Enzyme design. Sequence first.
Site, PDB file in Angstrom:
ATOM      1  N   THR A   1       0.878  -1.202   0.000  1.00 58.90           N
ATOM      2  CA  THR A   1       0.000   0.000   0.000  1.00 58.90           C
ATOM      3  C   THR A   1       0.891   1.220   0.000  1.00 58.90           C
ATOM      4  O   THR A   1       1.920   1.250   0.670  1.00 58.90           O
ATOM      5  CB  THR A   1      -0.908   0.045   1.236  1.00 58.90           C
ATOM      6  OG1 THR A   1      -1.944  -0.911   1.046  1.00 58.90           O
ATOM      7  CG2 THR A   1      -1.590   1.407   1.452  1.00 58.90           C
ATOM      8  N   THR A   2       0.498   2.217  -0.778  1.00 62.38           N
ATOM      9  CA  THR A   2       1.105   3.524  -0.686  1.00 62.38           C
ATOM     10  C   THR A   2      -0.011   4.551  -0.684  1.00 62.38           C
ATOM     11  O   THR A   2      -0.832   4.587  -1.599  1.00 62.38           O
ATOM     12  CB  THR A   2       2.078   3.794  -1.846  1.00 62.38           C
ATOM     13  OG1 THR A   2       2.905   2.643  -2.060  1.00 62.38           O
ATOM     14  CG2 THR A   2       2.960   4.989  -1.523  1.00 62.38           C
ATOM     15  N   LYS A  33      -9.060   2.961  -1.711  1.00 66.84           N
ATOM     16  CA  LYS A  33      -8.310   3.235  -0.482  1.00 66.84           C
ATOM     17  C   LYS A  33      -8.541   4.646   0.075  1.00 66.84           C
ATOM     18  O   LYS A  33      -7.977   5.002   1.109  1.00 66.84           O
ATOM     19  CB  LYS A  33      -6.816   2.981  -0.702  1.00 66.84           C
ATOM     20  CG  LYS A  33      -6.497   1.515  -0.947  1.00 66.84           C
ATOM     21  CD  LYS A  33      -5.003   1.248  -0.945  1.00 66.84           C
ATOM     22  CE  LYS A  33      -4.712  -0.135  -1.495  1.00 66.84           C
ATOM     23  NZ  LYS A  33      -3.289  -0.516  -1.311  1.00 66.84           N
ATOM     24  N   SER A 131       3.402   0.117   2.888  1.00 63.20           N
ATOM     25  CA  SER A 131       4.609  -0.646   2.552  1.00 63.20           C
ATOM     26  C   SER A 131       5.520   0.079   1.562  1.00 63.20           C
ATOM     27  O   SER A 131       6.728  -0.146   1.552  1.00 63.20           O
ATOM     28  CB  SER A 131       4.231  -2.016   1.984  1.00 63.20           C
ATOM     29  OG  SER A 131       3.274  -1.890   0.949  1.00 63.20           O
TER      30      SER A 131
END
Lengths: 212, 231, 222, 244, 240, 233, 195, 235, 204
Positions: A1-2, A33, A131
């Site tokens: 995930t960013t 998200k 991450s």
Amino acid sequence: TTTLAFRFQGGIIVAVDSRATAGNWVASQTVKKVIEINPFLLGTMAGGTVDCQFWETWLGSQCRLHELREKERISVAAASKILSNLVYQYKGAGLSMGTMICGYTRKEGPTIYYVDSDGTRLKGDIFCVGSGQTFAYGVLDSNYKWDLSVEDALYLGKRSILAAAHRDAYSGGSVNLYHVTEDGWIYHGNHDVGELFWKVKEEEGSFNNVIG
Amino acid sequence: NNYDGDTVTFSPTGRLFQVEYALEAIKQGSVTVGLRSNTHAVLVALKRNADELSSYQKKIIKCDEHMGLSLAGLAPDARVLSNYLRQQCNYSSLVFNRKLAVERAGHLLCDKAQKNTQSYGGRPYGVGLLIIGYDKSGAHLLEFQPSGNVTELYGTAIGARSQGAKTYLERTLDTFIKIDGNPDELIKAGVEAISQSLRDESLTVDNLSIAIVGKDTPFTIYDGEAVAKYI
Amino acid sequence: QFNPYGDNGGTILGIAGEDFAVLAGDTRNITDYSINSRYEPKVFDCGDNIVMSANGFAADGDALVKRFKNSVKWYHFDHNDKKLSINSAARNIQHLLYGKRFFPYYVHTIIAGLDEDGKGAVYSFDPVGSYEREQCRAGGAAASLIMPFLDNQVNFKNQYEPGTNGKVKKPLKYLSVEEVIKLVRDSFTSATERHIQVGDGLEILIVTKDGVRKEFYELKRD
Amino acid sequence: GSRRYDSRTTIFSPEGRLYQVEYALESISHAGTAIGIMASDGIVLAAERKVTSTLLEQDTSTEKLYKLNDKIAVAVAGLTADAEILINTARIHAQNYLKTYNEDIPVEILVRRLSDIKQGYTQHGGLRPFGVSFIYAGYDDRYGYQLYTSNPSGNYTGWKAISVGANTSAAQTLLQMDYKDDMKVDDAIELALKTLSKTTDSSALTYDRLEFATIRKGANDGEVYQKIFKPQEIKDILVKTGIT
Amino acid sequence: GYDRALSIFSPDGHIFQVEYALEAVKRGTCAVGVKGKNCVVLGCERRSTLKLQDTRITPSKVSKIDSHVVLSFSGLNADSRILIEKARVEAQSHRLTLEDPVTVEYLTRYVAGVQQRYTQSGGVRPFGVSTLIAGFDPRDDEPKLYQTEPSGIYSSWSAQTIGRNSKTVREFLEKNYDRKEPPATVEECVKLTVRSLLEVVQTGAKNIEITVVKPDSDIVALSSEEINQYVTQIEQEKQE
Amino acid sequence: TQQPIVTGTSVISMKYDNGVIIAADNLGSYGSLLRFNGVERLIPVGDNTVVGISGDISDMQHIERLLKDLVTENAYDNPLADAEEALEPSYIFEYLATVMYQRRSKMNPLWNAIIVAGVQSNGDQFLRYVNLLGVTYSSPTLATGFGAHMANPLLRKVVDRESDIPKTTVQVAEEAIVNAMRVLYYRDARSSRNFSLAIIDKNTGLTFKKNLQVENMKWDFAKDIKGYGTQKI
Amino acid sequence: MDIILGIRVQDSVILASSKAVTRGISVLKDSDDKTRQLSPHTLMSFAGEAGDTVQFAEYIQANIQLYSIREDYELSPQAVSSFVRQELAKSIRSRRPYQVNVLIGGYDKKKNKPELYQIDYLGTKVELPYGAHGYSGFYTFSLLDHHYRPDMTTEEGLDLLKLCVQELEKRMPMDFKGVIVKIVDKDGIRQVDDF
Amino acid sequence: DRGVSTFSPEGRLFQVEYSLEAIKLGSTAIGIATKEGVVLGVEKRATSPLLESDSIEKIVEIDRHIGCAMSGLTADARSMIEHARTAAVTHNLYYDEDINVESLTQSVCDLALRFGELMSRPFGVALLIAGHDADDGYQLFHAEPSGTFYRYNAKAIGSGSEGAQAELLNEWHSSLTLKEAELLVLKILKQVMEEKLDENNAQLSCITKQDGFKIYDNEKTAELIKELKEKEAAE
Amino acid sequence: SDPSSINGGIVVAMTGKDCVAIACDLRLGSQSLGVSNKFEKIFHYGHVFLGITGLATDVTTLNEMFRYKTNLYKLKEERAIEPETFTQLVSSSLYERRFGPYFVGPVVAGINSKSGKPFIAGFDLIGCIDEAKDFIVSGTASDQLFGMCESLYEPNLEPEDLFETISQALLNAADRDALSGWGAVVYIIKKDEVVKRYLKMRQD
Ligand SMILES: *[B]([O])([O])[C]([C][C]([C])[C])[N]C(=O)[C]([C]C1=[C][C]=[C][C]=[C]1)[N]C(=O)C1=[C]N=[C][C]=N1
Ligand SMILES: [Mg+2]
């Protein structure tokens, strides 16, 4: 995930990726998200899937109840603290959350709060969570200014997610952009990384390491 | 007199006045009729409005696919008791994969109402109920009184002027019991029965309320233009 | 030590069409290397034109479906027989799942039906209640075998138009119900070949404005 | 059921008075007079025991004056048993405060706590109120020497000189006449005894019918000493002031 | 636990326990509130039946709920302490969760909610207290003045009085207070408040308390001599 | 959470044209010790249902008492207790299945695997399984423990799918069941020769057979087997 | 969080607290103020587990502010420190204890003396001329032992504090992104904006 | 004394019937439902001229699609409103949709009879709940402390209710516009009010599908009062 | 990890002719780090003295607790608590936390005001009373203290002689313990005078 969010002249930019993974298996490339808490408030999603969805939708119910009771828009400070106080009650139980609560009010201006499942609640100008956060930070820190145009600020957010999508195995799919002004947030589309990468590479002259 | 302050007090002649006062609330309520054959069971209810701008208060409540009731008296007490029936019908289905018998549903309502008549602080229920249903032993009709007394019948009526409809059914007993495999004729008999309790007012399109359950017929309520056929 | 969880295998697949939706699932039930049943229905009609399947641990799967069916019943009682829309059903299921966040229903849930505009809809859930509307989703044992095939043959991923060489993508033309069923059958036939927990039979539930229809097909029993 | 027998202790009269509080105050008016006088260099507490006997063991007896801590004391007027319930609660509260903040409890904070307990019995619970009125004599480093009173209503007020129990109207008039702001402890001792001597329902005021106490900074250097007077010491101060 | 329903309806649709609580307020010492253009003043009566009192330590009639809000009352003194404590706790709880001090309207709404709850809860009687709550919202220069009563109803007031002989001082305020032009300064507002109490008080000595609240947590209580100067000036103008 | 102490092994069953058959041996094992030799593990409920139980025997006896109490309770205020409102196999199963799943959800399971065999009011065959985890499934043949591995393969050769049920008589079905019980005695180290068998037919009702024995066993070929490879004598 | 220091001089107490906040791999913030004003003449710095630190600090702040309003009086630093200790001593035997260490710097207006209290998460209280939590004391105490004299001025105290921070910046492995310094004296609390 | 949940010899709960008398003493509130929207209007009734009338809040928002007006012991309404708002928002959380007006009203009425020896007495306030949903369109309900609720095309509660209801009997038809309904509420309020009706002692509000629930400005209401005066003088 | 040796410290008590003595070190540490050299471990409630070793938070908590209890005792009893009675109160209070104990090693010392008899007593962390005639030891260097006391001690020592004996017992025991030292205090207790002496010792 960013996921990232940053304050600037034109308000707040919020940018996230779309990938969800179970081990090495790519579960979904189409994950929303960013949570639309209301027309004025956004929340980002990172960590475990459900927790951030469930409790940020719940947060929207609490904010709606606040402004029904108080006849006034809830502050970003108060909205973020409702969520942080809630997760602090569950501390130890195993919730998994890293989020940015983003908004724009008269009394505060553009505001971002990093909220965390260990109970952390931090106000700040720039936050990257997930991450692939380290990859996105690199692009942001070197290119960030206060005096950015809405157009340039949107691109920087898009580009920073792309940087992480490329390198981080657990980030990718597509980029969702949002721009937050005082009159509310504005959605700026879904951008497939598969098409965005080749486009940026060609136009920007970057990623010379990759063959195309 | 001195023995009607609460439900925990017998009178010198062995009467429970708070229970009798609760029974009085039913008599003030609007009329409703129940009757059945061997294949179907029907509820007919006269709805009551507050004035010409107001809606007509609903009288019939569904409890399950195979069971439901009509009310007369305090409507909120009917909601509490019907909610309890919904749960009990549901507990039977989830735990035992079994549709709750109509007779056993009456036994549960009786015992619930009884506890409210023997304890201090509480009060009796202020509503009468007519339960219809179709189970493994065919069609059924029950009459609930908030004293706790539940009775299985071929037909009956409760509410204001209910005596007229009750006499009609007592005459028609041999006819309507034989109406098997004909829902429309059984409803006709119910509409004709409730008509014996009307004065001044007549059955209009938003006045009348009908429900039916049977062999291959889930509990369904008819209101509005759906009952114009029977007017 | 007592282990409250188990794995009953199986595989399910949901596909949303333009004015329809399908939810398919194999009929085999297993533990370890044994077959419990060659025909144990896994996809259910829950009323209000909604179909549901909770794949994984069958005990938790049955419990969840049972509680949702119950939720539909009480939604009718409490809100004047209003039809429960697919989006509302989805949100309700999230709360059922999250209610047991710290002792989860060990299942992958998928529901299918039509949205309020009449278009086909599929929703997908993880065990702890996170959900998302999707065009295409496989769940369970052989999900990793089926999804890539559906990315390619439903969404035309990595496909381009001849002569242009990578410049122009293959256009995303809509698929008929007959065309979708073909892809479902081939997905399960292929999964049966390479996954030991998939086989015996395939049961498909098709949802349209007309209602819910069923189709059954034999699968290899080895 | 049980409602039949309920007195309803916590209700308003049509005039807006609390019945039980008013009747409790009536009870207290028959209790032995207690007086408190505050001076610049200390506080005096004087109180009259109710019609005693020659066979009462006085030196081991305590019905009026009680110690809450080293800095605070109380004079009681009303039901002694009720007062002891409250006194033990107050002693605990003082110790809780000391444990928490590592400082002796300020006088007002202790008084407010006890008064709030009394208030609760007038608003909820359906129980009868405590038939007790206190005079609090105490010292702390914020306000110095302080006198307070509380009654069954839970209302409390501060005083320079005050009386509770029997003949308060007559007593308060005499105190209001002879009290001055620059007064000292030795003068206040004399005023307290003279006031009791005139308001008493007994024929004469003697040592065996009195309880007496002083809170003085008359302790060696910057500190405070409580003195609960012994029978012989009350006898001596009665001769000194010229009452016997 | 004690569950007895003390507050109940009567045949004429009245809850007598709530109405008898208002009678306790009628008995209490007079309290008055007046808001100017940039201030609010709270005046309070002290009955002079009690002399030999220690005014240093005796509970004052006006209480700070927070640094920017004050509360005065008429009625039972012991009851008022319970409302003040709850209000003070809620004020800190609001700062802790919302990260902003309470508005005057919010604090009033809370206190009024407590009072109401005691009118339909088992085993409890209503509060024999009416309150005047005054102050300024955070980062706001508009004066605020609210009133509450035992029933639990509340409302905002340009000027208001409660307690004994409040009918008289309300009469005075209704003819002397102009909405189009309120007391422009602190002096004018205090003067009008002292004037209103002088209709009822008796002697203008230690019987009148005055507390001035200004924006940005600026609260101060006037002394005897400062008030005595207002008392002197009012009567010297009256001798004409 | 516990461990099973005294245990019962396989329960086996199948459907046939007019009803269902179920069987289970009469042993109560204490680890490797074959402790109790007279344990009945088929428990009839009315004249239309037989519940076969394996696993922990103390928990079996508890379930036995629950079923006995269920019959008593159903009779209360029920004039049709022996007719239309009698306990059905489907009712009995669903009740047990509810209890099993509730108990596993409190982390305190009834350590059993259960098969409910019976015939419904309309003549339909009922056969369904439930265990300590609350897992349930139905099939033309069902078996627990070792029966699952050895009995099912044999029973599935008779009834392989739904369409094979009408073609299977009661004689053919019983023969297959009895054979499976013999195979289990050859190969299950916690089984016994003595067993009980129950038939529930829609026409002839409930037939409960006790004190059956495994017979027609092949052992003679053992005399020719010598050593483990090279040994001749 | 990481480094919190305290020193008590002639007429004031000085608290220094790091600015960094690190979530595992990245430094999310470099301007974090790890302190809360409990009363006009009492300041508390804190360091411990994430979330618990701020939650505890604000909870204490609310309680002291409540006391101030109720009594219209400021509690002594000694009284505040004892209240804080008791809360931590209660906490350590709870279901989930507060994992928070604190320094309480206050100026007692009654005695006209500065006071520094060090309290760890167990509820271990000590009054000190200078104190620290975590590994901060391991580097700094040798310098303070040499240089501290109890009549120092505030300017001398800041210089000795700079020498401590310089040693930390030389020998500590972690980059704590400098410190926010605050002074507590008779006039109240103020922040040194250039350090 | 006697039980709080006692029945009278006529079969009515004493306390419920007495609470209805308290509602008759309350200030007037009127509601009118049309196909273009539902209008809600109230009498403020300030006890003194020094009372700032805009602080009198007798019309209240429950959700965007549901509003509410009150009459009687208005302090009792606060917990009912809180429950209504919670029920509306909670349903949206569980089902991702707006809640039906009837279902909201039913939830409020479930509180009504939760009294005994739960709260110590019934509510002394009646509510007019107005809203819109997709299934049943524009609706107006009357929620009592008995636990009963009726749907109305038009309804008046409070001290001038029976006079106002008789007026609503003659004036209401199924083709009323929103503008016509606004004037009609103003007209009837002016008829039953003690003091002369203006923008400061009376308040209007409405609920439409497009704009949702809105309380009217004093400037907006003032114009509608002027429009009313002119059209009554027109014949 | 071990709660009883995180902070460190020692206490020792001795009897003499018409007198008792109780002594303690002044160290408070966080394992290896020395934190404070002014952490006194001896407290007194009236004429009864209580030393406490172990986990420092509990040392503080118990002191506050016994101050609390002895103050209420005095108000109700109208007299100061005696050593024998206080010993029983400590035991009762510790045992009520049987399965969640205070990690401490208390030591009581004093002279009964009525009989004039010297009294000392020790406890484990959960209430067991050790009532020795000669001496009591407690803390991280209790083994060392046992060795010193067992050899140095003789009965019926005069107050000024007893001072030397207990001081040498503490000092030399502390110097063989890493978590004890950093100063020391000795209380000499007679029937109506108590002298407190700080000792000069090595500061490592
Ligand atoms: B992102 O990578 O953190 C993402 C955000 C989430 C809101 C979709 N998380 C996941 O995809 C996680 C895995 C993970 C990867 C890297 C860091 C942290 C977490 N996925 C899951 O937890 C998960 C669980 N069950 C099924 C599928 N995915
Ligand atoms: Mg296979």
